[PDB]
Design a protein around this ligand. Sequence first.
Ligand SMILES: *CC(=O)Nc1ccc(NC(=O)C*)cc1
Ligand SMILES: [Cl-]
Length: 95
Amino acid sequence: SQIPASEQETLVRPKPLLLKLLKSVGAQKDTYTMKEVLFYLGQYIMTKRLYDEKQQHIVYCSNDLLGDLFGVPSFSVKEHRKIYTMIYRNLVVVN
Ligand SMILES: *CC(=O)Nc1ccc(NC(=O)C*)cc1
Ligand SMILES: [Cl-]
């Protein structure tokens, strides 16, 4: 019986600009799960300290490659659906 659709892993290939961003914090592959992409995005935001020191859910990126890739000047980590949409536009699903 097929794995429940919800439970199947989303395998993804970052387009070249997102791949460059992931490589900058140590990612060394071309293909990831969606969880791994999120991990590296966390590492990138943390490393470059893009978050507001006081309201740390808030990320500032208008002067960052991340803002060009997501297409926004800033965002909150709490915007789960929007962030998922922003990421998805920077990769191709691997069937
Ligand atoms: C359901 C699921 O996959 N949850 C999940 C996966 C990975 C992480 N990563 C870290 O905790 C660093 C969190 C939750
Ligand atoms: Cl960096």
